[PDB]
Amino acid sequence: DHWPEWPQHSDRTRRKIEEVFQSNRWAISGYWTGEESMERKFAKAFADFNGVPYCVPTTSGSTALMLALEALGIGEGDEVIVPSLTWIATATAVLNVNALPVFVDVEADTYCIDPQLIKSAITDKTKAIIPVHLFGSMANMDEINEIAQEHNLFVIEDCAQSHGSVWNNQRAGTIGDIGAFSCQQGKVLTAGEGGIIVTKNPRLFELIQQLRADSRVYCDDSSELMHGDMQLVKKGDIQGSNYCLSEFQSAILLDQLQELDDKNAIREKNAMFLNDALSKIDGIKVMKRPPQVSRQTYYGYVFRFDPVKFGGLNADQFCEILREKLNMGTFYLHPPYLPVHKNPLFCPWTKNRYLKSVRKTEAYWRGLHYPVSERASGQSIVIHHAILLAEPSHLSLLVDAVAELARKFCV
Template sequence: MKSAVKNELKWPEWPQFEQSAITNLLQVFENKRWAISGYWTGQESMEQKFAQAFAEYNQVKYCVPTTGGSAALVIALEACGVGHGDEVIVPALTWLATATSVLNVNALPVLVDVEPDTYCIDPIKIEAAITDKTKAIIPVHLYGCMANMDEIMRIAEKYNLYVIEDSAQSHGSVWNGKKAGAIGHIGCFSMQQGKVLTSGEGGAAITNDPVLFARMEQLRADSRMIVSGHNLHYGDMQLVAKGEVQGKNFCMSEFHAAILLGQLELLDSQNALREANARYLDKQLAKIPGLKIMKRYELVEKQTYYGYAVRFDRAYYNDIEAEVFCEKLRNELMMGNFSLHPPYPPIHKSKLFCPWTLKRFDPAIAKDESYWRSLELPVSQSAELECIIFHHAVLLSSRDHIDLIVSAFHKVAQEVESGRSAI
């Protein structure tokens, strides 16, 4: 009987969408303009509609849509003048694109450790890592936490550094009245499949600085800029040559922009449900021995949860590793590893991070395998052993389903207690 109940468990799927996304896509098909580099058809492009909507959502002046979050980071770095010989401080615990984007502008990513209770970059470690070559800091708002932006901005101002917020996992979070991505000089977002705002692939960079905006617009469109549709005729090109800075083709398609316009309508209500369920989980899981709830700074007014993170005391749980803990929970909850998994490995220990394999990188920034693998960043390295991540779609469940998660943790804790009693 118990297995039959388990087989009926249905967790929310991701992505989710409404009819508005389909309606927008049909408009793109009918309009015959499928890219911002396509010709003018008399209608405002979906890409520009999304840029305006996303800038307004984040309460900033400018938005530059891109092909992905990595592209957004690259144009942000280059707009800030970061390049060969420069250093950029990034957290060791994040998706590796934060660091590889720095490599892709011929600069050196300087990895620093994270705070143990947020897994976001540690401001104390930032200041210790600054040299005369440092040009920027990239804080990452990771899983369900925000970095300490007040302290990071203080450090940046003290040393005259740019701050590029990697907000790929934090669409809609609010720190002291400002949206994630709108606090630093530039904010970068990913709209990849797993993100809370998604079109499968896509990204965006936002800013209040007109100079940085003008540079990023050219950097993502082969040195071209968009001109207003007021003076265009049917068949004209809306992208025109500017040539102030060498660019690449990182333009978002009309199809992706159309989907994002529909998804943006759902974001706040979905975020509110995720946050409510996350806070409920915080209260319930805090009662279970050996579990540790992630820290939320008092200045965080709204929190987006790309992933809900739970730390556990390995000593209490008989030194099991996170993957083993996850497997116990997956078996109980009938979840796959997309929904429940350990955190990322730290960048310098990740198999996916191997810049020395490409000849195009300067050896001074690519270094070699022994250099990266020998780095010691203990908090980042311990995370994948002692933390569990639930994908944000799980937080869109009913409260009954959330209670099943609590019960599953109770069961694992009880197994540990039973094991101790038997010794």
């Protein structure tokens, strides 16, 4: 018996792959072979799951974010507000469309973009905001939508770490103008690599299709197609490139989606258990869950600690101790990563592909200051969601480990 690992599959996953082989259609750009593509089947299923009208699968979360921006007409001379604490893609997607990402610090108890700091970052160039529902929390969409409405700004939800979360009875991604998701191996819904884009607007739906299929859209009626006909047809309303997801991946996502809500329920149940237990340890502070959140998807379970009460340990050392005591990998228990502006992987100034005006210089980005997002990697622990799938008796070990470590520093 060991800790739950990730990814996870079953014979159902295998059968979906076999279905792709049987259809002999490996791409949506391939021709019709008799029945609907895995892409459309997944898109329809995910649309119902999110209670959103339109869904367009794509290649990755990074590309989903990029196309979302393109669909909204964002480009050179524009500014896009994003949180400092998130994966660098949230910011590089902006640079990819020739726009300038503008960082805003996150809230101390949610690690999501601080609404009260967004207003000060708005300029005449600001065109949109990309809130990120980080780890196991949601950005305050009540506040964000209010700011967006008042300042005429678009909203793109980066839901790569929150498939299925619910804010005021709306699934994450359906709240903003366009929702973007990642299906990379570590995420709760994955096919190794993959992306998803959702929107409520019909026009954006057509634009997004074209943006990912070299300016093409689905034919008028797929029920009329005969074996050998193309399902994608020319449109040309907006220039796109090839960002189509392979049928093999759409098939795996279809399979994984079948158990997504239930597994999320299990993770959430265990997360609350941890909140109850861990919150009773002096010096330990769990994240603050807003009343508006009725369902929280935990891509990562996060809890913070007071170094003053824990022998001055940094998150790295804290995690090392826990991992040795619980015998779990670094991939499953570790501190949050560095904020984007300080992250070595974020280095815009290194390539000519980026406009000189937006890539700036190393000093410009590295010199930015966002206290909360910066201190996060030094005093908080992240538990990968796979662990949240373990039996309660096993999770207790984690709580005991933290308790033991606390008793050691208790004077």
